[PDB]
Design a binder for this molecule. Structure first.
Ligand code: SF4
Lengths: 60, 396, 74, 449
């Protein structure tokens, strides 16, 4: 549950921050969903963090 | 054993059907026959190479899953010499045998005299810069040397495994195979990497990728793992599994399939993001063709059907403990692996999704049918699960 | 490398594009480098697009542009 | 050979591992005091280096315009790679069901936490405006500015933060039973209540071990792609760029293999004295060193495979810049690092193939030292040499490091060893409950013959 929330949170944060709230053009990189490369790492790291925290805190 | 014979008959029927329609496509068009035969040879080579690699890996690190499918890995790896003879048609393509057999232009760009020779009509300096390395004599010599290495390793390991059923299993025939697998792993990595460079990557001499080849090993490992799960579900009641195999080896192999699926996705995404963010023009045409004329839909299907769907299904403790469910997932994985290779190889020839012909579907099934038939004959040759093995205690 | 390009006026008169057709033949075998990109970029159609051109036939290395840039941009 | 030799008892493991801590402060061995004094001296060197770097600036290093990344990034990649092997031992081996991780997972994971703590300073120290590091973090501000998230340094911030937090909570989860065994043997009343709140009143019982084992399995299954993605991102920071020597597609797995390569070398270098000093020869046997050297040899062979792929790529392409990269590595002004690379991580790792060398302790110490030097030389060859000579020949210059970045290097070694000496003094360096469980498993295996 927390891992899927974590992954979704990371993708939402990146999309809103750089493709919605302040649409900066950086190096001609796309501002659409075609910017799906370079959004995988932050999303993956966020999901792992929430999932790991849930396991340790949950066991306790 | 009867289930293995039924699988052998099914593989023979699929092989003769594929060869027949492949010969029909050759008579209709001689070029498209070789274009599809390259892709069929590349996709059918994954079972024997992956079987040999996993056999040597499980010898280095002994486990329950390794002893469970050791004889099956030896039977799959023993088909490598027949595969070398199957390379003869491809070698005939890039040799002077062209202008015959219906080939107007040579099968490979680096074998056309109009390109690699300075002063030619189609001189390309980038392709011609590799004229001593990318030569029909040098490529055939490298391929033959790799086949001698692979056949020698597979036949020696199988012969030592057969001799283990006679005597002296603890002192010898278990450490010798471990040391041979230790040096063989480095040998197998180098040979397969350069084999992938020569057969598939040399189709476009303007592009190269260092991660490529390792992507091929992870791809072949996922294919042979799903193939092993399917064949384990087929022969689950051979009176040898029933008395020595529990749910632990099935769970370990399911975990290995899950780990190799995320490994393949990790390699493919790594290559993509490296080429995508660094927009260098010498590496962009590869991902341009694979995202053009409908080929993007193939990539999107691989992203979802070959990553997310297997990742979530195999995430649970179930669906990997149950052999039936794991075999069903392995069948979907096998189907997806065929599409992935089509996405890598077929765009070079067809250049359109609609331009894909019937021979592009015929050659993979036609050659994997011969691979399955030889695998079933080699697995019926000897009994499964070597009883005389110090690692057999790991099954208790 | 293709840092500095030099030609002759007698050949430039017949074809002003002959210098670019060279190099690309020795590098690729064709007269045009079919560079392909994976990034879309931006449009810049109806808007102002600031650009600069440096004529190598007029540069003499007087280093006046460097002192002007230093005096203008702190 | 066996991973547990003598007829140990559960109380034998408990007393032998519990006697290293809980020793009265006046009974501390003199060797610990000498090592901690050396580590504290190097820590003062670290404090002087950081203080002067903050006062003057990053201009005290040898970085210039072409080479904007010097040893401030080399030592960072070196340190962040040291902990990959310990994360592999503490997580990957748990999934692989390997029995030789029970006696070295605690010390290895401690090395990961300390190496990550040392590597976590360079992204702040090399900044030039260090106090603004939080601008890379998405925080609510009075401006409305976001990080780019399309650069690899934003991935790097999220990766190190996740790596450090997950490794810390996993280490503490593994320490909870050992905390319970310590507060049960602490004797003194105020030494108790300290491990007691650390153990959270563990009360080792069923309905608790079940959730403990499942959470530990999930944590290891999650931390394996975590550390892989971390070092893959530390590889992406160079691979995303357009530098000829940096845009190499095989960098993610090559960096992962190199990280675990240098990690196993450092772990062998630091565990052999730990094994031979304390009476731990019954727990860390010679078969441990054998299999660890085998893994180190395999990872070194994957690194050599990466060397060959780079050479094949430079020879295969007709690009002037890949060819000059190979020429500048082979006969350039900095070719010494490439030759040291080829000598260290390619020639010196070959003796590991044999068994007599794999069972020799001094040979393992020398090989581990040579491997660590070669890994530092490889990071130097990848970064500095590639950055020295770029596309425009006029933008060519040489990179000569100063004394202050060296002072930071020795200083980071001292902080690393200070934290390690404090860990081996306060907490048990071998996981106790995992060792007695391994003894129970070996007893059951001997019962079933
Ligand atoms: S100011 Fe002098 S150096 Fe600068 S561009 Fe003009 S001629 Fe060249």
């Amino acid at each position: 549950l927390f891992g899927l929330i974590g992954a979704a949170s990371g993708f939402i944060l990146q999309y809103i921050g750089n493709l919605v709230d302040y649409p900066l053009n950086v190096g001609g990189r796309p501002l659409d969903i075609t910017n799906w490369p370079a959004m995988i790492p932050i999303t993956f790291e966020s999901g792992i963090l929430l999932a790991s925290f849930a396991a340790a805190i949950g066991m306790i | 054993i009867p289930q293995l014979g039924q699988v052998q008959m099914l593989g023979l029927a699929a092989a003769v059907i594929g060869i027949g329609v492949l010969a029909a496509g050759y008579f209709l068009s001689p070029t498209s026959f070789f274009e599809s035969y390259i892709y069929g040879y590349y996709v059918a080579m994954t079972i024997p190479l992956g079987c040999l690699g996993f056999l040597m890996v499980q010898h280095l690190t002994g486990g329950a899953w390794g002893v469970t499918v050791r004889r099956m890995l030896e039977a799959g790896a023993a088909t490598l010499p027949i595969m070398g003879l199957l390379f003869i048609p491809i070698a005939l393509g890039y040799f002077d045998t062209y202008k015959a057999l219906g080939l107007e232009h040579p099968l490979y760009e680096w074998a056309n005299p109009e390109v690699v020779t300075p002063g030619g009509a189609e001189f390309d300096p980038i392709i011609a810069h590799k004229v001593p390395w990318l030569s029909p004599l040098w490529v055939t010599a490298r391929i033959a040397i790799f086949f001698i290495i692979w056949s020698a390793l597979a036949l020696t390991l199988r012969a030592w495994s057969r001799q283990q059923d006679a005597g002296g299993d603890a002192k010898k025939l278990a450490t010798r195979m471990r040391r041979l697998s230790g040096i063989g792993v480095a040998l197998f990595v180098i040979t397969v990497t350069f084999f992938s460079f020569d057969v598939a990557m040399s189709l476009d001499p303007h592009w190269f990728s260092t991660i490529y080849g390792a992507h091929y090993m992870a791809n072949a490992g996922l294919m042979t793992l799903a193939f092993l799960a399917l064949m384990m579900s087929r022969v689950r009641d051979a009176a040898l599994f029933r008395e020595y195999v529990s749910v632990k080896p099935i769970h370990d192999i399911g975990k290995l399939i899950f780990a190799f699926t995320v490994l393949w996705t990790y390699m493919s995404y790594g290559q993509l993001v490296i080429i995508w963010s660094g927009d260098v023009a010498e590496f962009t045409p590869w991902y341009v063709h694979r995202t053009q004329h409908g080929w993007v839909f193939v990539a999107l299907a691989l992203m979802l059907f070959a990553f997310a769907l297997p990742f979530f299904v195999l995430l649970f403790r179930g669906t990997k403990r149950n052999l039936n469910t794991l075999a069903t997932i392995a069948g979907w994985i096998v189907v997806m692996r065929f599409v992935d290779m089509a996405w890598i190889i077929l765009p070079e020839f067809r250049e359109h999704l609609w331009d894909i012909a019937i021979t592009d579907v015929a050659a993979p099934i036609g050659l994997i049918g011969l691979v399955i038939a030889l695998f079933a004959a080699n697995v019926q040759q000897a009994p499964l699960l070597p009883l005389r093995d110090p690692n057999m205690e790991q099954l208790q | 490398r293709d840092i500095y390009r030099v030609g002759e006026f007698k050949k430039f008169k017949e074809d002003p594009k002959y210098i670019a057709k060279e190099v690309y033949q020795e590098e690729y075998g064709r007269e045009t480098p079919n560079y392909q990109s994976l990034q879309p970029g931006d449009d810049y159609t109806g808007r102002n697009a600031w650009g600069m051109t440096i004529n190598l036939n007029a540069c003499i290395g007087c280093n006046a542009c460097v002192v002007a840039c230093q005096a203008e941009n702190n | 050979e066996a991973y547990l030799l003598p007829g140990e008892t559960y109380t034998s493991i408990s007393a032998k591992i519990g006697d290293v801590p809980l020793t009265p402060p006046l009974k501390t061995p003199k060797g610990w005091l000498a090592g901690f004094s050396v580590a504290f001296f190097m820590l003062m060197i670290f404090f002087v280096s950081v203080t002067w770097l903050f006062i003057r600036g990053v201009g005290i290093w040898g970085i210039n315009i072409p080479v904007g990344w010097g040893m401030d990034i080399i030592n960072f990649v070196w340190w962040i790679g040291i902990g990959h092997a310990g994360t592999l031992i503490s997580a990957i081996l748990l999934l692989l069901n390997q029995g030789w991780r029970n006696s070295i997972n605690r010390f290895a994971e401690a090395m990961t936490l300390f190496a990550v703590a040392c590597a976590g300073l360079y992204p702040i120290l090399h900044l030039g405006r260090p106090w603004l590091f939080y601008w890379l973090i998405p925080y609510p501000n009075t401006h409305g500015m976001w990080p780019q998230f399309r650069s690899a340094l934003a991935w790097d911030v999220f990766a190190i933060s996740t790596y450090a937090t997950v490794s810390l909570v996993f280490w503490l989860v593994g320490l909870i039973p050992d905390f319970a065994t310590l507060r049960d043997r602490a004797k003194n009343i105020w030494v108790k209540r300290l491990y007691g709140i650390a153990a959270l009143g563990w009360r080792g019982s069923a309905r608790h071990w079940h959730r403990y084992e499942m959470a530990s399995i999930l944590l290891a299954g999650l931390s394996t792609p975590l550390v892989v993605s971390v070092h893959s991102i530390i590889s992406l920071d160079f691979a995303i760029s357009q530098v000829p020597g940096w845009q190499v597609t095989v960098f993610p797995p090559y960096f992962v293999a190199g990280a675990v390569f240098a990690g196993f070398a450092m772990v062998l270098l630091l565990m052999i004295p730990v094994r031979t000093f304390y009476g731990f020869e019954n727990y860390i046997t010679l078969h441990h060193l054998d299999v660890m050297a085998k893994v180190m040899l395999t990872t070194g062979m994957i690194v050599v495979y990466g060397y060959f792929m780079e050479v094949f790529a430079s020879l295969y392409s007709g690009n002037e810049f890949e060819e000059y990269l190979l020429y500048n590595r082979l006969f350039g002004p900095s070719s010494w690092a490439y030759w040291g690379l080829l000598f260290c991580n390619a020639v010196a790792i070959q003796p590991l193939w044999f068994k007599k060398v794999r069972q020799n302790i001094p040979a393992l110490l020398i090989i581990s030292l040579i491997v660590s030097v070669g890994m530092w030389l490889e990071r130097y060859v990848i970064i500095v040499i590639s950055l020295e000579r770029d596309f425009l020949p006029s933008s060519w210059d040489i990179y000569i490091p100063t004394i202050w970045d060296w002072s930071l290097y020795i200083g980071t070694f001292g902080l690393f060893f200070t934290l390690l000496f404090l860990f081996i003094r306060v907490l048990p360096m071998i996981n106790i409950f995992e060792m007695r469980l391994f003894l129970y498993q070996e007893t059951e295996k001997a019962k079933q013959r």
